[PDB]
Design a protein around this ligand. Structure first.
Ligand SMILES: *[C@@H]1O[C@H](CO)[C@@H](O[C@@H]2O[C@H](CO)[C@@H](O[C@@H]3O[C@H](CO)[C@@H](O)[C@H](O)[C@@H]3O)[C@H](O)[C@H]2NC(C)=O)[C@H](O)[C@H]1NC(C)=O
Ligand SMILES: *[C@@H]1O[C@H](CO)[C@@H](O[C@@H]2O[C@H](CO)[C@@H](O[C@@H]3O[C@H](CO)[C@@H](O)[C@H](O)[C@@H]3O)[C@H](O)[C@H]2NC(C)=O)[C@H](O)[C@H]1NC(C)=O
Ligand code: A1D8V
Ligand code: A1D8V
Lengths: 381, 382, 383, 384, 383
């Protein structure tokens, strides 16, 4: 029945803009702590982290005190935030939005002037990223909290505990919290001539790779497997060019997608991008060999002549190495029959050359199957 | 309206009634706040961001002892319509909001009865944060909650309570995607930390699956049933690799669409999203076997030799297990003999060529059954 | 000035919380009318209607009245809206926020007490899309206004006219408005005790079917036309699989786009979706048949054998129904072999030509079946 | 501190209530000179038919309650004052689509010794337009801005024009659109006089350098690949690939063009009709290619040749297409005669095959002439 | 009590300090606002919309003669912290903004010294408007600027001054996407305009070409080298047009990717955006010549006849330049004579057929040199 009287008498001789220090030239103590409720998302393209926090301020007051007697009971009280003086603890490394804190939750004022202010806030900070192990990577974000206008000589920012209290956290599905610690630093800035105090809270998250493996890694290896099969196809099937083109287009699509879904930092290159470019350049190199093999399969003595060294080579030396074994009226009738027989003899002699060119194309295809299968296997390892 | 003006002026000015003090004239005087949520329309559920949007009318009723006139001295008014920002309020807000804000929607009038009751009823449109489970995606049943907590006070100051153990439909417009199953309500209190109290409403919903059965599911089955025809095309046709590659890319494109209606998590993957991977593996193995069959088909005695062990197993034992089976005159004499002898050698090689075209036919039939037994076993195992 | 005295004597004791009524038992008769300005959009995937409209309120205060002879500056007093009494007219079926667009504006004030408040408002209402004849559908999106606090015994929501005024409308390019009307009800809600009144304005719009006819009907019709051809190609060219696979892929892509366009309501299925699914099933059936004629065209007497029944049945029935209609002895011994070799080769060839004719009859059988079946189901499905 | 003196006296001595128009009598319409100054063009987005502009609306009028002289309070003649202190006419854009009506931020005015008031508030605007797209590569439009007062009418205010053209003094040239003319005009209704406003037109050009050398040449390359489709030989076995690829590319280009700009509100652009015509031609080409392929693969063991076919083709049609078409001694005799007779029959069964191969050459060439002519005599209507 | 509140109670009120009146001691005297920008972090540079966003601090200084107090009357306290607003403020804001609201920054505090000096340093996040020039992408260097003007006052009232020609870069964390070259500051005034004054800070930023030199430039080069390969094919494989169409599709994909990272202006096109169009034209011409070669290769004497000029040119002249080098007995006689004469004519047909194949090989090799010569000489004009 006297809370209104207490409010009227307490909020009569009060100035909001003055520090609550009775003996001037004495720094005031502000206790700081933070609580995390939900890590909304970690944006990798724009390098922005979004969290929800409960900042906690507990500072003693040289005023705003009374006696529990007279006003029977009423040991504590709640007052609007705007009426009392508050410190302006701002977030330095902002990314987008406003520097100030949100919410207007009232402050619980104790018997001796101790004030507990716990306003909610949702922050969008800036976090550098390393993508050198993109499917399985660790990130080291950081939040920097410090007073803007006041300095060390007027503020004595301390900490409660060297840990963020995980008393209420809706767990993120894709990121796992592994560590969260805070530290206090004493720094001196430029364009200003006094020492300033700072408090940094640095998260430590880990990724769960289930979504980014069965969707990105397995198809990549499936397509990388299909490349080597070009050199086992026969040249007469007619489908030799389709396989290479399909593999190349699939690699193009996969590289495009992974490039789309990663940050554009040029400090380093991901270990997956190197492999993708490596497989891409070999896949391009395999279309060239196919064209230079299909041309040897369709050569005939009527248009091309075999040289004198492609006989000793590609037929005796290389096949051995690659384990390829090489498997009156009678006169008028006489000349008519003789011409028919001689035509057959020259047809089989020509057909002999028409299969030597077919065997050379088989050797060249085989000698590149082993070169590829080595570097393709060795390249991953 | 001569009575209403004097009533309002006296009641809200002469006492100097301040709307910053919780009504209490005892040691504790826990002022209880009745709650009864009332749904109006289920707007949407977003399974990608796990956010659900509703349209509810929260109802709160308490008893303020500072608003009690006589109702006969004031010409019998018996009721009032004081606007919201003049009466003490308990500040009940949603405590699991998605965007981040907690504040309530538009402030309307609140009816004050003649014995001190209050019947505030503000409309609102919330955006809660649900946990979507995706394991039977076309036919799934979800469980979304709405947790209400006091933004200013707690126990030792108030005590929340319910009036009906369920949510009320009233003005409801049915949706075409989800159908309501039940709407239970429960009050959570921890009997070791006194400064805690809340009221939770469970939204249990179930999808209507005709849309994603007409789409998605049927085309997936249609394109999966085409994966076995590669083993029936003849090898000299020339489109073996055309058929078995275009199917794999079609399956790959269908998988990426499914991962677009599914949240990015690491806990659950749809049963439909696991069948596609199995079919992908089967199709890749089919591609490899087709390449091997193509290589076996195009063989000749002039480049390859048939090993004696190949002639036995294939062409004798395996095919029956698969139920399949198949002077002067001397010059004329010499010249004619050569022509006949040349024809004899050609016919002997054509028989060896026709052996390779039947070995490749037996192999393709062997893999037709093998790639059929493992398809049934995998499908049953899901 | 006399206007200052008028304003002072008006707002010397006025209170903005009490219904302006002579007694405590009389409804405040208010008139209502809605003028539409611009139909913004009718978004369907996330069913919502957006409009710009002006709300016209007229009622009659009794304490805001002055002599039009004692004073000057008479018959008009533009008073700011948030200073006098105002009925709380809100849109019930709202989609997101915007339960009441108040604004500031101004309120007219005659010398007999009347007020003619008219604030602009933009409303994101919610109306359920109904698709069965897309893109020739016919929508009936509606708006519902009502006083949220006062019941029928304290506010009487009358109506003026019988339709929304359209003499401000910037005509839309996609939707054509057919008939917009308005009507009044009386309701008794479950979570209440007294009678409540509401006024509902329902718009009746019709789509303009040219944007979706060019981009969704012509290409799909072409694709549906092209799939029949695969039964006319010869088996020797080797291009049947290309044609059927391309048709199937195009149909799948178009169906997925159509899915992306229309909402996710699981009540009724559009006719175009039914046609797309039917054509997809038919195309999938053709690929199965094409494989079985390619497998038949490449049969030889060395591997396969004619079982004596296909020969008779096919070659004796189907074309009719389908309207297909020393030393000298040594020379003889070697010469005899050459002639015998040709006799055996020709006998083999005529059997192989019989397998090629069977695959021609089978292909033409399904050409007639597909044409017949694809048209007596389309004639039933499509109206 | 003469500003302190003048500011305190003017708003209180004269009883400036900021709610009453400065009228000496009932019918004393307050003239309000107007002018618009363009600053940027932003976008003329055609998907939603909504523009975006930045303008400076310069207004001027006279107030009889703001006058001071004959005392010379430290020599002050300008009394710069915030907007929300004095009467304003509330002139707003009356064709907005967003729903925003008033200026962006209320700035300060100027007040002179004789009472004149000058105001230059900035404001962004998103008006509504009717887009004519029948000449999409290079199109000319006409977009208007309407200004009106929602509190007063012609019996209270007298909106007038300073100059019949907006000012581009501070206009930053844009690299997408070209300005032609900006004529301003007034409007009034002789019947029932209560309507007054001013209107500004924004006649613009698209300066085609992005949609004329790109996306116009790829739409003719794929258009002219059809004759290539018709020139291929049948034994090559690649006709289907080329024709299907051409059709798919045309469909993709048409869909992309439709996505970029909404094709038809009442009229279709001059490129969509061309693309539809080309797609129809390509479908007919596919059908004729299938027919030619079927005709090519025929032999005198599966099909026969009617005499009318040999009369029509190979004789008359090729000429008009300019084609040329250039003891045991008795037993051994029996076996030799059989071999020779078999070869004679084979030679006759090949000539018939070569007759089928040449017929498919005439049909293929004939449709090339029709395609090369219809594609030219059908493009005059929709492009001229 | 602590005299810090007494300083305020004796300096602001009582003497009635005014925050709406300029501190000009008299007429014809200008204020001396100083300025010094300090960068803190470059957030991102956008090219699709030409918007650059930063996080900068704007220190300001001036003098107010009213804020003066004796340092000995009040014990100590040389410096006092006046809070947000509460004193005179020259409203200096960024001119060229993205939204165009000209919104002011939030107010934090003003550290006021004893001798009238006022220091301010508000933090802000700005989104200006740049003029991105894309002609050497991805090796380009840009120049986006910020302009600061007074929102209320003008010249003849204030005198903007740059405290240091360069902009401070302390407490600057760097960016892995863009570099920083120089940050000059200029002061622009017009001798004829009596009310124009501002300060402009130029940002010269160099891009780091490693996310594109490994992602876009290399695959384009590989695809072009593939595009060369068409002419080295035997023309018997039946897969000539597949390579051409696949290369064209890949080039189209790569071109469509680029047009999403480039403003849709009409002034210039990247040097990598013209090489692709050149390659598209070359590939289309290669398609045309491949169709012609395939048509030529499949000619036989029973359909076409070889003109003497074709033979004389393409079998003797061109290959040198291209370096290519190539009664019972009577009845038996009557029956045998036909068989040999049948073979003689058959060998003449094959000789003519094999001549049409060599012509299609000289034509093919001729265009391998022509296209390659153009593909290099025509490219050296693009660098
Ligand atoms: C990246 O992760 C590291 C690992 O925690 C963090 O940076 C550095 O963390 C160490 C300890 O974790 C800090 O050292 C600590 O400093 C106190 C100061 O009182 C000193 O007594 C001890 O040596 C103690 O180990 C170190 O200061 C800190 N570095 C910086 C620059 O803050 C942090 O989580 C992440 N760092 C950044 C820059 O994001
Ligand atoms: C759009 O939907 C509305 C409501 O679903 C329908 O039009 C309106 O229907 C109500 C009845 O639900 C009509 O109001 C009253 O109808 C009763 C008969 O039930 C009768 O006493 C009066 O005719 C009274 O108006 C209302 O008139 C009607 N609106 C019209 C006709 O414009 C209908 O399903 C759809 N509207 C149209 C025009 O098809
Ligand atoms: Cl205070 C109060 C009293 C009654 C009330 O009814 C709401 C219903 C919904 C349609 N009108 C709301 N609030
Ligand atoms: Cl009024 C004022 C004076 C000094 C000041 O320094 C800010 C420093 C930067 C880290 N805190 C800010 N504001």
């Amino acid at each position: 029945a006297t809370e209104e009287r207490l409010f009227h008498k307490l909020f009569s001789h009060y100035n909001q803009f003055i520090r609550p220090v009775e003996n001037v030239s004495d720094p005031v103590t502000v206790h700081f702590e933070v609580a995390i409720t939900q890590l909304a998302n970690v944006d990798e393209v724009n390098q922005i982290m979004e969290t929800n926090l409960w900042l906690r301020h507990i500072w003693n007051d040289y005023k705003l005190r009374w006696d529990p007697m007279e006003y029977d009971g009423i040991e504590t009280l709640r007052v609007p935030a705007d009426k009392i003086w508050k410190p302006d603890i701002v977030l330095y490394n902002n990314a987008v939005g406003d520097f100030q804190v949100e919410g207007k939750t009232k402050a619980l004022l104790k018997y001796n002037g101790m004030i507990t202010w716990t306003p909610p806030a949702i922050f969008k900070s800036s976090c550098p990223m390393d993508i050198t192990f993109f499917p399985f990577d660790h990130q080291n974000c950081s939040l920097k909290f410090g007073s803007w206008t006041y300095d060390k000589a007027e503020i004595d920012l301390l900490i409660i505990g060297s840990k963020v209290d995980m008393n209420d956290f809706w767990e993120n599905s894709e990121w796992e919290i592994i560590d969260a610690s805070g530290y206090k630093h004493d720094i001196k800035y430029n364009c200003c001539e006094e020492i300033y105090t700072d408090i940094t809270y640095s998260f430590y998250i880990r990724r769960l790779p289930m979504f980014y493996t069965i969707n990105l890694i397995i198809p990549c290896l499936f397509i990388s497997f299909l490349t080597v099969l070009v050199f086992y196809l026969p040249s007469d099937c007619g489908e030799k060019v389709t396989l290479c083109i399909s593999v190349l287009l699939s690699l193009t699509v996969f590289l495009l997608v992974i490039t789309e879904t990663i940050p554009s930092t040029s400090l380093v290159v991901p270990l997956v991008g190197e492999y993708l470019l490596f497989t891409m350049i070999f896949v391009t190199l395999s279309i060239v060999v196919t064209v230079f093999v299909l041309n040897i399969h369709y050569r005939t003595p009527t248009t091309h002549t075999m040289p004198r060294w492609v006989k000793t080579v590609f037929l005796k030396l290389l096949p051995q190495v690659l384990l390829m074994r090489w498997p009156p009226e009678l006169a008028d009738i006489l000349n008519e029959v003789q011409y028919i027989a001689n035509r057959f003899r020259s047809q089989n002699e020509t057909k002999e050359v028409e299969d030597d060119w077919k065997y050379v194309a088989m050797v060249v295809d085989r000698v590149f199957l082993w070169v590829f299968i080595i570097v393709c296997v060795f390249g991953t390892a | 309206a001569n009575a209403e003006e004097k009533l309002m002026d006296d009641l809200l000015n002469k006492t100097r009634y301040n709307n910053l003090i919780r009504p209490a004239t005892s040691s504790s005087q826990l002022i209880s706040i009745k709650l009864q949520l009332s749904l109006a329309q289920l707007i949407s559920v977003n399974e990608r961001e796990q956010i659900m949007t509703t349209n509810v009318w929260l109802k709160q009723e308490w008893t303020d002892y500072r608003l009690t006139w006589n109702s006969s001295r004031y010409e019998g008014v018996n009721i009032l319509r004081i606007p919201a920002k003049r009466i003490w309020l308990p500040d009940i807000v949603l405590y699991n909001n998605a965007d981040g804000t907690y504040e309530v929607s538009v402030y309307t009038n609140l009816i004050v009865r003649s014995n001190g009751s209050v019947l505030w009823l503000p409309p609102a449109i919330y955006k809660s944060a649900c946990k979507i489970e995706v394991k039977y995606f076309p036919f799934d049943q979800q469980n979304c909650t709405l947790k209400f907590r006091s933004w200013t006070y707690d126990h030792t100051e108030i005590d929340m309570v319910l009036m009906t153990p369920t949510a009320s439909m009233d003005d409801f417009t049915p949706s075409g995607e989800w159908d309501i199953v039940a709407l239970p309500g429960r009050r959570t209190v921890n009997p070791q930390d006194p400064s805690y109290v809340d009221v939770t409403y469970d939204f249990i919903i179930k999808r209507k699956p005709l849309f994603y059965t007409i789409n998605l599911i049927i085309p997936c089955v249609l394109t999966t049933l085409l994966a076995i025809l590669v083993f029936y095309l003849p090898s000299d046709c020339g489109e073996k690799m055309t058929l078995c590659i275009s199917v794999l890319l079609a399956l790959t494109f269908f998988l990426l669409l499914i991962s677009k209606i599914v949240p990015p998590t690491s806990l659950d993957v749809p049963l439909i999203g696991k069948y596609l991977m199995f079919t992908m593996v089967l199709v890749t193995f089919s591609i490899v076997t087709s390449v091997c069959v193509l290589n076996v088909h195009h063989r000749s005695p002039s480049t390859h030799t048939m090993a004696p062990w190949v002639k036995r197993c294939f062409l004798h034992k395996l095919p029956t297990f698969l139920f399949m089976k198949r002077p002067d005159l001397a010059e004329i004499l010499e010249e004619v003999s050569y022509i006949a002898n040349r024809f004899r050698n050609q016919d002997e090689d054509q028989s060896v060529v026709e052996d390779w075209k039947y070995v490749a036919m037996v192999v393709d039939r062997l893999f037709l059954w093998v790639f059929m037994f493992v398809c049934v076993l995998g499908t049953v195992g899901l």
